[PDB]
Amino acid sequence: AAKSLSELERVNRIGGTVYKVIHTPTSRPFALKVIYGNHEDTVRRQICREIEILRSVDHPNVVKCHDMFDHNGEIQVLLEFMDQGSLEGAHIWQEQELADLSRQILSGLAYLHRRHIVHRDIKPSNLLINSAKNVKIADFGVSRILAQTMDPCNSSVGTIAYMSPERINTDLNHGRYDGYAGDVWSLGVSILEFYLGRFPFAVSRQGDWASLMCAICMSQPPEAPATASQEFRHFVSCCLQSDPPKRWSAQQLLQHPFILKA
Amino acid sequence: SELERVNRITVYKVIHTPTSRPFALKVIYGNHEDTVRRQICREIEILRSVDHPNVVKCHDMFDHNGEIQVLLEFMDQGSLEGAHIWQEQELADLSRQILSGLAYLHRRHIVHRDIKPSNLLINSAKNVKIADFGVSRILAQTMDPCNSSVGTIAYMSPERINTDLNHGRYDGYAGDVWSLGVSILEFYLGRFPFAVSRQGDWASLMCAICMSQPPEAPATASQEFRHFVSCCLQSDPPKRWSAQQLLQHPFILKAT
Amino acid sequence: KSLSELERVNRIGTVYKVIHTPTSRPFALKVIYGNHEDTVRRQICREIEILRSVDHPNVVKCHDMFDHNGEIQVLLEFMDQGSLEGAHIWQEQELADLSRQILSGLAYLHRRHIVHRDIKPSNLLINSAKNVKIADFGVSRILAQTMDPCNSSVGTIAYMSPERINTDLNHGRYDGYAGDVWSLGVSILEFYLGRFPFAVSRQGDWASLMCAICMSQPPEAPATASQEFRHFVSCCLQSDPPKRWSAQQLLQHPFILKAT
Amino acid sequence: AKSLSELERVNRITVYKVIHTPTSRPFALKVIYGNHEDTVRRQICREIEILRSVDHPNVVKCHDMFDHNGEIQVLLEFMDQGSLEGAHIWQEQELADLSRQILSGLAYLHRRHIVHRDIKPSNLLINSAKNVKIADFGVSRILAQTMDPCNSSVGTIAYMSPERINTDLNHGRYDGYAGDVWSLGVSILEFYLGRFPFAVSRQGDWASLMCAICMSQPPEAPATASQEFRHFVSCCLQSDPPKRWSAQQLLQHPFILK
């Protein structure tokens, strides 16, 4: 949706460093993000991962990049502009509304997962929403692409507050985790967070390591309050099983009775 | 966490002021480094899970400002360090309890790694509970070697010191059973069953433990007890019996 | 020949041209130095063994090796007309004849389980006789089995296969053989076009070279070329590495048979 | 012996000549210091293990060993004539009889799964009874099966095999057993020739010693020497490691049978 960077003029700063640019011929907004190529081997691997994921994805609930630029040995990606920002600290107590938000996020995550892309950082701040009240999955900074449908992930990446139990306590399984199931955990914490309007663990999300790990790995996982409907209660239980094969896939949750509501 | 700290034994003695009952209070401190953080995960997961008469159950956990304070069962008559128990019937009922807790920990794939009389607590009811899970690992499978040279030097099997045979990898189930056989024989003699001090240098401990034949019960002792310490102190670790397989030893049949 | 019989004449680019004073014969002399680092000590053992063992018309032969003053000096063939760097071949029989000779040497090296790892126009030497020989073995490795992965990031970024720049999926392991046949195919399409086939400075930033090689489709011969040469380059430049032909299989391609 | 206060330090051989003042018998005494590093400690526990097991006429056995002050004192039998270092022994019958003794001592350690990894004339000692014994175990290792490789590049460079210098081709791994049979045959040819059998000196740079022993052909005995002895060094000094004979295969070689 552009051709070159002479058409683009930076207008504001978004949110990593992201700008709002305006494409001068069309008067249309975009987001422009820079990915700079330093000499670290593990930063170069994540540059290659993020570049591949960004150009390949095409889904209404994954933020699409329209163009990419290698101005001066830094890569500049041209993303959709999401004008109403993140769903961070959004309170969706309306259960109908929550279900329509959750369906879109689930379409997106099911897309990424059936292309073997694990996101590894699903937090309300990475779920962006626009004027049209549609929601799209965003940051691929720590996200990975997998050679099989069942290839384990060994890297400790992401935000600890929304990490799966098996993504924090790594001793028994020797670091490896079902990256898919880990994302389905991260969604279910997010959707309960929208329902509760707080972080659904009884610890500050800025809290210390051992204070977060004791709430997530050592407690029973968060359940939706008994006030809520069965199908929402049963939805979060399909997401926040502490044993990972017990929890559903993203594809399966789209057929869950909570999400089948519009 | 509104009870009152009483006595320092770091581990505290506390009394819960509503019910005036005693407890033991251990602190666990949150670190920045992966081996200490995963040791907190290994320990704080074994403390909550365990439920056996011969294992120190903990009752509650608290987080104060990023440090985990864990509230354990208070053991009345302290530890068995120093202790001399030379009546076989008495030592057989004492051994029967420590094996029951250990055979429980092993079948839940928990290695202790620091079984010693310092961590075999006793109470006024004269019953015995396995104590300090600070070095303990939870294994994936029933055969899963441990690479970490940790525990207490004097009580650990020769393969936990002479690491170069299997490249640092040892059987942890046998690693505890050698640590138990040293501790039961230290009860029968009244002293550490090796020709050096436990608080010695590395090399002097290494020659005593790895290089001589493992210690034996004196021939004064009955054949049941002499057979039992050789079933725990084998030098090649698969010959050592499992903790459960020792509860059918006829030394243990002397209990009650 | 001895180290005091032959003396320096002129520098090739670090490696010198020497003349054997007794036989008045041109030769090339390369110094190999023994560093205190142990990864240096393996690379000498690899490079030296490769140089003595190779015996093929299309791979630069070693004639003598000298132990002087803790330095190993290797007497190589002299090549009269330098390298094929910057070369442009537009006559297709001229390019098939060049290709068949580079393929003969690479098929030799691959059966002797040597992966060269810096195939580029710079390291393809040509003499007055117009015979092409494969040159620089400073980054080459000699492999245990017929397939056995490489870990090391060595070579020129611009002539690496995508899987040597990227290192995600097989996590830095790569087929060294298939990595060479890519390096060959870029070198042969560089001859046809007269330019680097990729639209970026060869002496470029990592990130600009990464998007040009990994993240666009591999370059094709233009349609103005023959079908046999179009299909040949596509057999070398497969982005999935086992789709690439071996050097052995490419020697039987219809384009190579244009050499007569 | 019984104690450390029954020995008097006499002369330096760290290894010491000591005399047992009650028995008036000489023995050899070695210190191994407790080092901080987990890998020197790994070498300490290997070195001590090998000493206690050995029961052979042609291996230096230790009679007893002692500890005080975090230092391990090991008490070895005294070899009063010294080493076979610089021995120009050309007699095809006398050397046959020295090659009988080093092969009995080496074949004992190899079926007892111990790789010596520093065989040299310096570590081959001789007594007043002119019996020969294998000595320093500072680098030596004990292995799990008969079929276990070594990964460490230690010892002395000038008596290494090609496979112990050319580390890359087998990813640091070498046959320790046949790598001692090389080190043996280099010593046996060094005894016959009275010089080190390669072109360069021992003390030369690693680039000089590599091109002599990796990149040249391995040495042979001159054809003037007996077709038993010329064949003998051919069974020890192969460039290909499995083409070496076993040290127990060599005990019944025609050269060692003389």
Residue numbers in the entry:
A (entry chain A): 63 to 77, 82 to 328
B (entry chain D): 68 to 76, 83 to 329
C (entry chain H): 65 to 77, 83 to 329
D (entry chain G): 64 to 76, 83 to 327
Paste lines from the article.
One truncation mutant containing just the kinase domain (residues 62–335, hereafter referred to as AtMKK5-KD) yielded crystals, diffracted to a resolution of 3.2 Å. The structure was determined by molecular replacement, and each asymmetric unit contains eight molecules forming a double-layered ring. The overall structure of AtMKK5-KD exhibits the classical bilobal kinase fold, comprising a small N-lobe (residues 64–149) and a large C-lobe (150–329). Interestingly, five phosphorylated Ser/Thr residues were well resolved on the electron density map of AtMKK5-KD, two highly conserved phosphorylation sites within the activation segment (pThr215 and pSer221) and three additional residues in the N-lobe (pSer66, pThr83 and pThr108). In our phosphorylated AtMKK5-KD structure, the activation segment of AtMKK5 between and including the DFG and (A/S)PE motifs (residues 205–232) adopts an extended conformation, protruding out from the catalytic cleft between the N- and C-lobes. Notably, the phosphate moiety of pSer221 fits snugly into a positively charged pocket formed by three guanidine groups of Arg115 from the αC helix, Arg186 of the catalytic HRD motif, and Arg210 within the activation segment. The pThr215 residue, by contrast, is largely exposed to solvent, only interacting with the imidazolium moiety of His182 from helix αE in the C-lobe. Consequently, the prominent αC helix in the phosphorylated AtMKK5 adopts the typically active conformation, where the important Glu116 on helix αC interacts with Lys99 from strand β3. Therefore, almost all the ATP-interacting residues in the AtMKK5-KD structure are well positioned, clearly demonstrating that the ATP binding site of the phosphorylated AtMKK5 is largely configured in the absence of ATP•Mg 2+. A charged or polar residue located on helix αD in the C-lobe of human MKKs can coordinate the ribose moiety of ATP; however, this αD helix is absent in the pAtMKK5-KD structure, replaced by a stretched loop (residues 152–157).
